[PDB]
Symmetry: C2
């Protein structure tokens, strides 16, 4: 059924990345993305709490952002993802993303990049 992100308009979906961190997103009729990110990555801060997520999806690309502060736990960090839709020959749907990370540690501000692959959960 999935053609591109225009297929998510009006839907509520859960996605998991390769370290078992979970994004639950509502995509509105115009491709506006709202929802929650839960960090489960071992040896990271701010685990197991929902963090507000916001972004936008259009055609075959998507981008979304979290700041790691929610009034419960603050990890002095922010993450954003930019990505594209990938159809597996298995049948399923993935978002291939590159994340950008900014944080303030003991040596002040730092920026990092890496990959995350999100797999649609058919709940």
């Amino acid at each position: 059924g999935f053609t591109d992100f225009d297929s998510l308009s009006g839907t509520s979906t859960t996605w998991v990345n390769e370290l078992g961190s979970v994004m639950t997103i509502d995509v509105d009729r115009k491709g506006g993305v709202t929802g929650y990110f839960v960090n489960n990555a071992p040896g990271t801060g701010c685990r197991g709490l929902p963090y507000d997520l916001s972004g936008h999806a259009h055609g075959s690309t998507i981008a979304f952002s979290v700041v790691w502060s929610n009034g419960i736990a603050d990890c002095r960090s922010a993450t954003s993802w930019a990505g594209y839709a990938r159809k597996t020959f298995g049948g399923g749907v993935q978002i291939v993303t590159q994340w950008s990370l900014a944080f303030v540690g003991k040596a002040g501000g730092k920026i990092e990049t890496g990959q995350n692959v999100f797999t649609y959960q058919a709940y």
Copy 2:
């Protein structure tokens, strides 16, 4: 006191310009939700000179935001996400030191490019 944190910007629109001459004007909600617009000026790029919606999240000294390059006027079939930290400047100014990813989908499907931008606050 100059810049203290992003939260304190809630209620005042702020304009920022990066080293490519791209400009964004952002509005911060009470929870640190970020909305506003981005005008791209990057040499060689499409979707230059008109506003694109931006969304994101900010708290303390970190921010993450993204833009999908489609505004009902020109669609570049791409999305950029930034994450950055606040750097205070001699004389009471502030910059956002960012890492970015651009996801674009052409004939070969999706590809990712990355780089750095530094945004300067213009009072």
